[PDB]
Amino acid sequence: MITLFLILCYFILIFNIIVPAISEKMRRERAAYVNYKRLNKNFICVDDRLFSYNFTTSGIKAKVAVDNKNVPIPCSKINEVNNNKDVDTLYCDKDRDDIPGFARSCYRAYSDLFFTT
Amino acid sequence: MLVVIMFFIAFAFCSWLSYSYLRPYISTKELNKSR
Amino acid sequence: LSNSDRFSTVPVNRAKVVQHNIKHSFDLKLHLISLLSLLVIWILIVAI
Amino acid sequence: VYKHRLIVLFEVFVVFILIYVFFRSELNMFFMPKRKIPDPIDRLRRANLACEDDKLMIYGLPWMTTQTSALSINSKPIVYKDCAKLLRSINGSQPVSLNDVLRR
Amino acid sequence: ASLLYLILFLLFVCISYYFTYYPTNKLQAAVMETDRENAIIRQRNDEIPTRTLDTAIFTDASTVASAQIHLYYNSNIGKIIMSLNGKKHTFNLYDDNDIRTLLPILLLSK
Amino acid sequence: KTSTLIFFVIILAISALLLWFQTSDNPVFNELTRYMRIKNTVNDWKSLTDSKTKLESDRGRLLAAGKDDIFEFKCVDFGAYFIAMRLDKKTYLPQAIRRGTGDAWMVKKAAKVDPSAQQFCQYLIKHKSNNVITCGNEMLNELGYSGYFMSPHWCSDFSNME
């Protein structure tokens, strides 16, 4: 009699809480991505790192510009980084401990994306 | 047994509603295909 | 100048206007509604 | 009837699937312990100064396997005949690292 | 067992509370996380003094003069900027030469 | 036990009906959820402002290095108006000359080159410099907004351009 209660509670959680939450999250992140695409061009400078955001099935995702030696390019040459669109792009989803403070930079990039858009 | 099949019916209907409502969002391929 | 009296000579703090509007407005009690709904469901299934 | 337990476990499994697919990062950086951000000055907290003969000298550097002398504003070694007197006048009779200077 | 049901229901309550009262989307959650960690980072930066500091600076190998300097720590590149006689000089905490030059001034300050 | 299953099915139907209510373009659900959303957003305004002002105070700390003239009033051109601002001595946020009890002064210009506007800004600096407005939390407490997230505004434009 309690297991039926738990089944029903989890049904409510899935279909009345999580699903509209997914819809709202996708709506907000797509709006932010649209504003970013219309305002900022390709990579942007966040904590002296080059970040660009793309919209996929799992929402918005931030990728950092790294060179052939998986080292982030400083913002000092951002202009040429705009021209060379085929540079190495390392995603923020994977916890790459080789690059120091990757979570720092990724979270700050998302924060700046929210604040600007 | 009857409760199990009733819950499957409810879950299938609700999943159909959720997918039909979420096609514009989760299916990014659809939205980038149609501009 | 037709609606000159519609404007304010003094500056207007519109954030406080919105905050009073939110303060003195109907409170959809979703917390109470959710607690009551969970209690109803538990009583109907587990208790009865 | 174990079917009810099996189906509630299926419910929790699909909840975790939905969380992992979409809300992976939010739940990852919310409901999980995380490592403290390293500080370059934290490693240098143990860096202190002394005198070798007539040269200001640096100790406490971890990666400095072999002791290396200090440098002035002109990238030159600091040679002072009263280095010990300078340490006694400034840092007193006890060695002073970067920790207590920073905490001042 | 009753314990399994209790923990499952508590997991329900926790997840529902999170989704109702906490930022579901990545942007706002990242804003909150950056707020916290930037609070710690700003504490770390403000731990470094920013006011006038009296120190004996060695202009050459065997010449030293007492003077006042200013300091500011930047964690974007992990470096220090110091002001002396209206001139700004940078010192990196990773470069050996920069730390070797910076240490005598920082350690000889009263 | 039959009543338990009947209640189970009824509540499952209620949940499905609520989900149908949510997913469809129902005006009532939209109105209620917009009500809740607006309330939550206006609640969050304060925390967003505090975060942005802490970040921008850090950026102002970084920017003010070796430039003492930044701490003195300067007449800056905004294309359509002149504003006399500087960096705050304490908080290191932009701080301009106030106009009465409102926002910063804005000497409107009627063309690209307006000597009278600039000279009036100089007059404000040399005379009416006792009353100032600072971006961030002070402007939030006085006028209800922090200057950031507002386009166009002098706080965000001055921070971005510098």
Orientation angle between helical segments A102-116 and A19-39, nearest 10 degrees = 80
Instruction: Kindly state the tokens that stand for A2.
Output: 């309690």
Nearest CA in chain A to C40: A5
Neighbour count for residue F104 (Cβ, 10 Å): 23
Q: Do A59 and D8 touch (CB under 8 A)?
A: no
The reported resolution of this PDB entry, expressed in Å, is: 3.0
CA-nearest of E2, A48, F18 to B14 is F18
Nearest CA in chain A to B25: A26
DSSP result, A16-41: IIIHHHHHHHHHHHHHHHHHHHHHS-
Task: Output helix, strand, coil percentages for chain D, rounded to the nearest 5.
Answer: 45, 10, 45
In angstroms, the separation between the Cα of residue A108 and the nearest Cα of chain E is 6
Nearest CA in chain F to A18: F19
In one-letter notation, the amino acid at residue F76 is V
In angstroms, the separation between the Cα of residue B22 and the nearest Cα of chain A is 7
Q: Do A2 and C41 touch (CB under 8 A)?
A: no
Q: Measuring CA to CA, how many Å separate E49 from each of D98, E103, F112? A: 13, 15, 44
Cis peptide before F115 (omega within 30 of 0): no
Number of cross-chain residue pairs from C and F with Cβ atoms under 8 Å apart:
34
Q: Do C22 and F42 touch (CB under 8 A)?
A: yes
Contacts with A12 from chain F: Cβ below 8 Å: 15
Q: Which of A3, A21, A47 has the CB atom closest to E19's CB atom? A: A21
Contacts with E40 from chain D: Cβ below 8 Å: 37
Cα separation, D17 vs F84, whole angstroms: 56
3-class DSSP state of E72: strand
Q: What residues form DSSP beta bridges with E56?
A: E66
Q: Find out whether D58 and D31 touch, Cβ atoms under 8 Å.
A: no
Write out residues 44-103 of D within 8 Å (CB-CB) of B. none
In the Cβ-directed half-sphere of C5, how many Cα atoms lie within 13 Å?
0
Angle at E102 between CA D62 and CA A101, to 5 degrees: 60
Helices (H), chain B: 2-26, 28-33
Q: Do A11 and F12 touch (CB under 8 A)?
A: yes
Q: Is C41 on the interface with A (CB under 8 A)?
A: yes
In angstroms, the separation between the Cα of residue C42 and the nearest Cα of chain A is 7
Q: Is C42 on the interface with A (CB under 8 A)?
A: yes
Q: What residues form DSSP beta bridges with D48?
A: D59, D97
Q: Report the relative pairing of strands E53-57 and E65-74 from DSSP bridges.
A: antiparallel
In one-letter notation, the amino acid at residue A82 is N
CA-nearest of F108, F123, F100, F98 to F78 is F108
Cα separation, D24 vs D16, whole angstroms: 10
Cα separation, F125 vs F119, whole angstroms: 10
Select from C35, C46, C48 the residue whose CB has the most chain A CBs within 10 Å, as the one to mutate to test that interface.
C46
In one-letter notation, the amino acid at residue F40 is N
